């Protein structure tokens, strides 16, 4: 085996410094192809890791470079023939690779060959091969290098458009399948989902099925750190494409059960975008919405954490946009939201310190809040006053304003009475 | 416009079909008849994301507003298209979806309006549409609505451009045709796909 392998490597080497032409070699290509279909089959075996990896490497690389050469120059018949066989082989490899490591990277060289090779590569052979490529990328580094190179590089025809997104729809199906099990494997799966995103951040194309899938999916049994990493991954995968903020917003608004995903995409926009004060507005909208609905009532288990998540999305937003107007209308709103524990944490975080202290200084905003509270609604008003107080500086004007508040406060027959109680505490 | 649009958005959100349309119709008529700058202004004024698709829906409600909608929204597009979001949702709509006899007409007139408001919008869409004709993954995927949409597109395309258009687009067309052909030659509705072929054929004989 070793002796035979050594001879094969030698042969490969020889053909390496003798392949500076490549004209009418369709014959060579075909022969090679059939031989190597069989050879790949045989190849899945043993052979001192990389003794086999080297062999395989040569074969693939060599093979693809030649098969796709056919595609470039020559005849479609031959091309199709090779593809059919090669696709089968690709499928086979997508299985072997792991232990090989060096030859797993040789299989990665074969996938890079598919990239160069284009439509043939893209087809039957590369349906399973795109899946494998995704896996490899999410397994990492060198793959990533090549991948981001192609992330700018006309995107490999945006990974072959329809098919690219169809593979992504297969990935949507896979996301659904992961929602089921997937610990670190699914972490990398999501990584590769986003790898494809980087490759062809063709959002719309990807679309619908996947959208729904993802939505449902945000509740994996094995969250841990991989889970949040991947949360970030999908959110940041949204990045900045077509429908972007809008699309995201839509699905999220529907099932207001996932504002961590809101944060994710908020932040996706924050580190990947366009229409920027317009994105401040989008953000603003979502943010505002969130607070307004949620903090419009109360909660206990899940939605207390939902409020926490809301603080996080506020975060992304606020920081990213320096939005200040939109942002702090919602901060005076959202800040006013703070309430207990976690609240404060989230508040400062979202605040993005400059503006946090800006608000601290701010008294016009305070007056706005004063009258807001005057109109009242519930506990929102109550705690608004609470944190207003917390935000100590110097009443002065606010002292006079609050005297008026009290007066109203005092008056209160209904729950406006307890509002006044808390207010009074603040005043004290 | 702010209040108007606020209200508009709200309206749409709150309720489609009847409400919206009735209002619209009457309004439309009147407005059309007597306004230009102002017309344009209100129209323009339209907003939100909820109201963007709010307006998508609105627009389609108005489409259902039929031929009145056509002429008047030829003037409504003439009131206003103002690039950006219009384009966004135009293609949003382009992509998707549900019910289009109204849009056939819908499609047509809408297209007409916008296209003529701002030339070459169409061209891009037409260009874009070519890609949409394709399959494989799509062949595996979709329902039959997509095909419906496709048909409509074909029709509009046939209707207008530059001439020159034909030539370059024909590059793409040919390409499209070939792959598409294969795919759809595989059409159950083999004839559906065939019909498309004939259309295209005609287009660049």
UniProtKB/Swiss-Prot annotation, chain B:
Hydroxyproline modification sites? 164
**Domain of life (superkingdom):** Eukaryota
Misc note: Cells overexpressing TELO2 are hypersensitive to hydroxyurea (HU) and undergo apoptotic death in response to treatment with HU.
Complex formation: Component of the TTT complex composed of TELO2, TTI1 and TTI2. Interacts with ATM, ATR, MTOR, PRKDC, RUVBL2, TTI1, TTI2, SMG1 and TRRAP. Component of the mTORC1 and mTORC2 complexes. Interacts (phosphorylated form) with PIH1D1 which mediates interaction of TELO2 with the R2TP complex composed of RUVBL1, RUVBL2, PIH1D1, and RPAP3.
What clinical condition is it connected to?
You-Hoover-Fong syndrome: A syndrome characterized by severe global developmental delay, intellectual disability, dysmorphic facial features, microcephaly, abnormal movements, congenital heart disease comprising developmental abnormalities of the great vessels, and abnormal auditory and visual function. The transmission pattern is consistent with autosomal recessive inheritance.
Task: Tell me which family the UniProt entry assigns to this protein.
Answer: Belongs to the TEL2 family.
Name recorded for this polypeptide: Telomere length regulation protein TEL2 homolog
Gene for this protein? TELO2
Q: Which residues of the full protein are shown?
A: 211 to 415 of 837
């Amino acid at each position: 085996x070793x002796x035979x392998x050594x001879x094969x490597x030698x042969x490969x080497x020889x053909x390496x410094x003798x392949x500076x032409x490549x004209x009418x070699x369709x014959x060579x290509x075909x022969x090679x192809x059939x031989x190597x279909x069989x050879x790949x089959x045989x190849x899945x075996x043993x052979x001192x890791x990389x003794x086999x990896x080297x062999x395989x490497x040569x074969x693939x690389x060599x093979x693809x470079x030649x098969x796709x050469x056919x595609x470039x120059x020559x005849x479609x018949x031959x091309x199709x023939x090779x593809x059919x066989x090669x696709x089968x082989x690709x499928x086979x490899x997508x299985x072997x690779x792991x232990x090989x490591x060096x030859x797993x990277x040789x299989x990665x060289x074969x996938x890079x060959x598919g990239x160069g090779x284009x439509x043939x590569x893209x087809x039957x052979x590369x349906x399973x091969x795109x899946x494998x490529x995704x896996x490899x990328x999410x397994x990492x580094x060198g793959x990533x290098x090549x991948x981001x190179x192609x992330x700018x590089x006309x995107x490999x025809x945006x990974x072959x458009x329809x098919x690219x997104x169809x593979x992504x729809x297969x990935x949507x199906x896979x996301x659904x399948x992961x929602x089921x099990x997937x610990x670190x494997x699914x972490x990398x799966x999501x990584x590769x989902x986003x790898x494809x995103x980087x490759x062809x951040x063709x959002x719309x194309x990807x679309x619908x099925x996947x959208x729904x899938x993802x939505x449902x999916x945000x509740x994996x049994x094995x969250x841990x750190x991989x889970x949040x990493x991947x949360x970030x991954x999908x959110x940041x995968x949204x990045x900045x494409x077509x429908x972007x903020x809008x699309x995201x917003x839509x699905x999220x608004x529907x099932x207001x059960x996932x504002x961590x995903x809101x944060x994710x995409x908020x932040x996706x926009x924050x580190x990947x975008x366009x229409x920027x004060x317009x994105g401040x507005x989008x953000x603003x909208x979502x943010x505002x919405x969130x607070x307004x609905x949620x903090x419009x009532x109360x909660x206990x288990x899940x939605x207390x954490x939902x409020x926490x998540x809301x603080x996080x999305x506020x975060x992304x937003x606020x920081x990213x946009x320096x939005x200040x107007x939109x942002x702090x209308x919602x901060x005076x709103x959202x800040x006013x939201x703070x309430x207990x524990x976690x609240x404060x944490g989230x508040x400062x975080x979202x605040x993005x310190x400059x503006x946090x202290x800006x608000x601290x200084x701010x008294x016009x905003x305070x007056x706005x809040x004063x009258x807001x509270x005057x109109x009242x609604x519930x506990x929102x008003x109550x705690x608004x006053x609470x944190x207003x107080x917390x935000x100590x500086x110097x009443x002065x004007x606010x002292x006079x304003x609050x005297x008026x508040x009290x007066x109203x406060x005092x008056x209160x027959x209904x729950x406006x009475x307890x509002x006044x109680x808390x207010x009074x505490x603040x005043x004290x | 416009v702010s209040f108007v649009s606020q209200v508009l958005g709200k309206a749409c959100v709150h309720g489609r079909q009847q409400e919206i349309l009735g209002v619209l119709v009457p309004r439309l008529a009147a407005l059309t008849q007597g306004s230009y700058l102002h017309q344009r202004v209100c129209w323009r004024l339209v907003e939100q994301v909820p109201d963007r698709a709010m307006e998508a829906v609105l627009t389609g409600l108005v489409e259902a507003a039929l031929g009145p909608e056509v002429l008047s929204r030829l003037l409504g597009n003439l009131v206003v298209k103002n690039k950006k979001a219009q384009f966004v949702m135009t293609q949003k709509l382009l992509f998707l979806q549900s019910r289009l006899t109204t849009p056939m007409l819908q499609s047509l007139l809408g297209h007409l309006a916008m296209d003529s408001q701002r030339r070459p919008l169409l061209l891009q869409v037409l260009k874009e549409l070519l890609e949409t004709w394709g399959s494989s993954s799509a062949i595996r995927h979709t329902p039959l609505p997509q095909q419906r949409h496709v048909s409509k597109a074909v029709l509009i395309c046939l209707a207008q451009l530059g001439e020159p258009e034909l030539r370059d687009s024909r590059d793409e067309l040919l390409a499209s045709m070939m792959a598409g052909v294969k795919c759809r030659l595989d059409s159950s509705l083999p004839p559906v796909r065939r019909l498309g072929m004939i259309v295209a054929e005609v287009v660049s004989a």
